[PDB]
C-alpha cells in the first residue's frame, strides 16, 4: 500500500515459468506487482547511498592575486626575465611595450615586459568518483496487508539492500514468505562514466568527460597543503592598455557561472550521507516461495461498516476503508462486483486477500471496478453493505494512457524499457535486441545536441521524407523525424 496515490505507479500482472518476473525500479516510480494466487505487493527503490567517495580533482573558482611584479627591457635586448617565474604559485605573462628616451632607454622601439603575480585559490571544488565496492542500493517491499495505517505510509516496508558484489538477496516478508531477488545492479547506471562533484554544500552527478573538459584550474586533489593549479590563465586577465604598462585582474568568483553550466545535471543530497536520490534499477522477483496467509481462513459472517468515504486513486482503482462489526474472529473478507441490475462479476481485487486481523482495526480493501455503473458488495449476508460507484473513461482512454506511459518509459530507460515487465517471451527478446541496435545508433548520432536542436532537425527530416520521391528515403526519414520529435519533446527532464 506504500505505492498508493503516488501518481507514478505502474502495474505488473503477468507471471511465467518459476513465477520469476523482472521489473525496472525507477527511483521516482514504484512497482505494484500482482499474481493469481500470490500476495500482491508494491515495490520501490528508496536510496542508492554512495559511500566512501575518493576525490581526484580540485578545480578553483575564487582566486586571489598577490605580489604583482613587473620587469621591462630595451628594444633588441631580449625578453624581460623575473626570478619569480620558477615558482608554481606565480602566474606570469609576457607582453610588449614601447619606450624611448623618456623611459631612460637610448634605443627607440618596442620593449619586452613581464608581469608575474602569485595566484592563491580560495574555495575549491572537489570532484569525487564512486567505486562499485562501496555502493548500496536499497529496496523496500510492502505487502498489501490491508493494515489500518498502511494506505499511504512511507515507513512501512521490508528493507532488502543490494550491492554490486552481492547481487542477489532474499527479503523475508513477515508471515507471507520470501520474495527472492535476482536483481542486476551493475546495468542500472554507469558510475564509471559519472563523477560526483561537490561545491559549497551541494552536489551533482556530472559526466566524467564533461568534468574533464570544463575550463577551470584543476589540481591533483591529494588533500595536501599549497596545491599547485594547472591552467591558471583561466582566472587571471592581463590588460595592456596603450602599450605603456600591464595590469592584472583575478576575474572574481565563478560560482554563479558554474551553477549555470550545470543546467543539465542532476542534483543529489551529498549533505549528511552522500545519499544519491536519482537513478533506476532493474530486478526480477522470484515469487515461488510466497504464501497467501489467508487461504485457510473462513468467510466473514457478519456485517461491515466503512469508516472513510470511498476515495478513487489517480490510476482509476477504488480504495475502501471498511471495519468489521459483528463476529469475533479473523476471517476472509467476502467481495463481489455486480452491476446495477445485472449480476456480472467484473471487478478485480488489487489486494490479494482481504482479512480482518483483530476486528478493532479497519481494513483498507482496494479494488478496480469496470468502468460504468457497478455495485460493490462486501458481505456474505443479505445485510451486506452495497457501494455503487460510477467509473469514468473507456478502454480507449486506458489504451492511450498505457501507450503514452510506455513511450515515456522507453524515452528514459531506452534499451532496458523493453524488459520492464517481461515474462521471458521469445518475441520480447527480439524486440529488445532490435531496439538496442537502433538506440545504440541513434544516441551515437544525436549525443550532445539540445532539445530545440532535436526538434528542428526532426522537423527538417520529416520535411525531407515527405518531399522525397524514394520510398525507402521517405519511410526512413519520416520515421526518424517522428521519433526525434517525440524524444526532443521530453528530453529536458
Amino acid at each position: 500500500m506504500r505505492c498508493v496515490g503516488v501518481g507514478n505507479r505502474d502495474f505488473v500482472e503477468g507471471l511465467s515459468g518459476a513465477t520469476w518476473v523482472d521489473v525496472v525500479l525507477e527511483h521516482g516510480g514504484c512497482v505494484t506487482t500482482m499474481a493469481k494466487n500470490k500476495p500482491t505487493l508494491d515495490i520501490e527503490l528508496q536510496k542508492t547511498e554512495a559511500t566512501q567517495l575518493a576525490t581526484l580533482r580540485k578545480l578553483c573558482i575564487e582566486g586571489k592575486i598577490t605580489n604583482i611584479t613587473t620587469d621591462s627591457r630595451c628594444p633588441t635586448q631580449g625578453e624581460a626575465v623575473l626570478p619569480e617565474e620558477q615558482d608554481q604559485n606565480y602566474v606570469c605573462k609576457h607582453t610588449y611595450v614601447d619606450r624611448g628616451w623618456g623611459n631612460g632607454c637610448g634605443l627607440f622601439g618596442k620593449g619586452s615586459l613581464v608581469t608575474c603575480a602569485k595566484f592563491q585559490c580560495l574555495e575549491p571544488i572537489e570532484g569525487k568518483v564512486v567505486q562499485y565496492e562501496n555502493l548500496k542500493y536499497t529496496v523496500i517491499i510492502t505487502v498489501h496487508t490491508g493494515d489500518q495505517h498502511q494506505v499511504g505510509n512511507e515507513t512501512q516496508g521490508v528493507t532488502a539492500e543490494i550491492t554490486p558484489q552481492a547481487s542477489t538477496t532474499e527479503a523475508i516478508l513477515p508471515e507471507y514468505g520470501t520474495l527472492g531477488l535476482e536483481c542486476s545492479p551493475r546495468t542500472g547506471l554507469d558510475f564509471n562514466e559519472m563523477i560526483l562533484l561537490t561545491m559549497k554544500n551541494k552536489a551533482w552527478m556530472v559526466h566524467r568527460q564533461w568534468f574533464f573538459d570544463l575550463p577551470l584550474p584543476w589540481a591533483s586533489g591529494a588533500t595536501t597543503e599549497t596545491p599547485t593549479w594547472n591552467r591558471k590563465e583561466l582566472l587571471v586577465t592581463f590588460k595592456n592598455a596603450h602599450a605603456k604598462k600591464q595590469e592584472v585582474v583575478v576575474l572574481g568568483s565563478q560560482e554563479g557561472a558554474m551553477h549555470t553550466a550545470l543546467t543539465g545535471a542532476t542534483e543529489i543530497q551529498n549533505s549528511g550521507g552522500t545519499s544519491i536520490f536519482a537513478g533506476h534499477l532493474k530486478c526480477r522477483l522470484k515469487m515461488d516461495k510466497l504464501e497467501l496467509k489467508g487461504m485457510s481462513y473462513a468467510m466473514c459472517t457478519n456485517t461491515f461498516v466503512l469508516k472513510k468515504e470511498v476515495s478513487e486513486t489517480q490510476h482509476g482503482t477504488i480504495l475502501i476503508k471498511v471495519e468489521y462489526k459483528g463476529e469475533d474472529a479473523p476471517c476472509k473478507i467476502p467481495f463481489s462486483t455486480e452491476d446495477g441490475q445485472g449480476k456480472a462479476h467484473n471487478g478485480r481485487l488489487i489486494t490479494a486477500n482481504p482479512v480482518v486481523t483483530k476486528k478493532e482495526e479497519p481494513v483498507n480493501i482496494e479494488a478496480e471496478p469496470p468502468f460504468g455503473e457497478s455495485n460493490i458488495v462486501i458481505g456474505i449476508g443479505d445485510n451486506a453493505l452495497k457501494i455503487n460507484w460510477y467509473k469514468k473513461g473507456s478502454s480507449i482512454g486506458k489504451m492511450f494512457e498505457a501507450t503514452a506511459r510506455g513511450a515515456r518509459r522507453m524515452a528514459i530507460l531506452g534499451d532496458t524499457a523493453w524488459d520492464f515487465g517481461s515474462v521471458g517471451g521469445v518475441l520480447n527478446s527480439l524486440g529488445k535486441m532490435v531496439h538496442q541496435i537502433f538506440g545504440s545508433a541513434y544516441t551515437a548520432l544525436f549525443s550532445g545536441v539540445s532539445w530545440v536542436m532535436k526538434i528542428g532537425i526532426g522537423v527538417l527530416l520529416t520535411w525531407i521524407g515527405l518531399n522525397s520521391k524514394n520510398t525507402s528515403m521517405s519511410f526512413s526519414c519520416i520515421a526518424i523525424g517522428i521519433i526525434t520529435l517525440y524524444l526532443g519533446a521530453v528530453v529536458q527532464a
Partner: antibody
Amino acid sequence: QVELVESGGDVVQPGKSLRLSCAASGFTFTNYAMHWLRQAPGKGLEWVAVISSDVNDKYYADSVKGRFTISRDNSKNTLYLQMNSLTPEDTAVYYCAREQAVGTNPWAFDYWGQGTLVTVSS
Amino acid sequence: HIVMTQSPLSLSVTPGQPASISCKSSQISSWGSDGKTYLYWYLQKPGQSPQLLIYEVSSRFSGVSDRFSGSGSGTDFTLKISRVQAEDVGLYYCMQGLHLPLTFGQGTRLEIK
C-alpha cells in the same frame, strides 16, 4: 555568511598561561590566512599575531613577541592561540580576523569575530 | 612600524551633513611593485565588532553604504561621508597594511550634534 566565533575566554591570574581558540565556519579554512587582534578597554585596536596559508609561517607583534603562540587546526576548521606569561596589561577583547576575500595584500582583514574577553588580574 | 596619526579625535556633526576624517601616515604606504596604496578604514559600531568600509584608499568594501568614499595619495588620506545618518556613531579606525607589523590609528569618534 561566514561565521567566526570565539572560545576559551575566561578570567586568569597573572603569570598563568591560557590557550585561545577561534572556531571558523562558512568558508574553506585551509586557504585563508588568519589573524588575532585585541582591543584593550578604551584603547585603539591592536593587532597581535598572524598565521599565513601555509601553517609553518607565522609572525607576532613585537609588544607581544615571545609571549604568545599561534596554531592552526585546519582539519577541525578552527584557529588556536596560545597565551603564555600573561600580564595584567594583557587584558582585552580578542578578535579573530579572516584574510581578505578580494584584494592584493597577502594579509588583510575583512570579517571580524564576535569577540572574547580575557581578564588578567589578581 | 609605521605609526598612523589621525587629525580628528572627535567629530560631532548634525544629521544630513558631510564629514571629513583624516589619517596621516608617517611614511608613504605606496607599494612600489604594483603602485597601490594599502590604507584601510574600519568602523566599530558601539557594542559591536569592527567592520571594513574601504578596503583600499578609495575602493569601498562590499555591503557599505553609498556615501563612504576615501582619498589621499602618499601620506594625507581622507574618509568623506556625504550625508551623516544616525547609524554613523562609532570609531573610525584607519589602518595601514603596507608593512607586516601593521598598526591602527587611535581612531576618531563620531556623534550627532
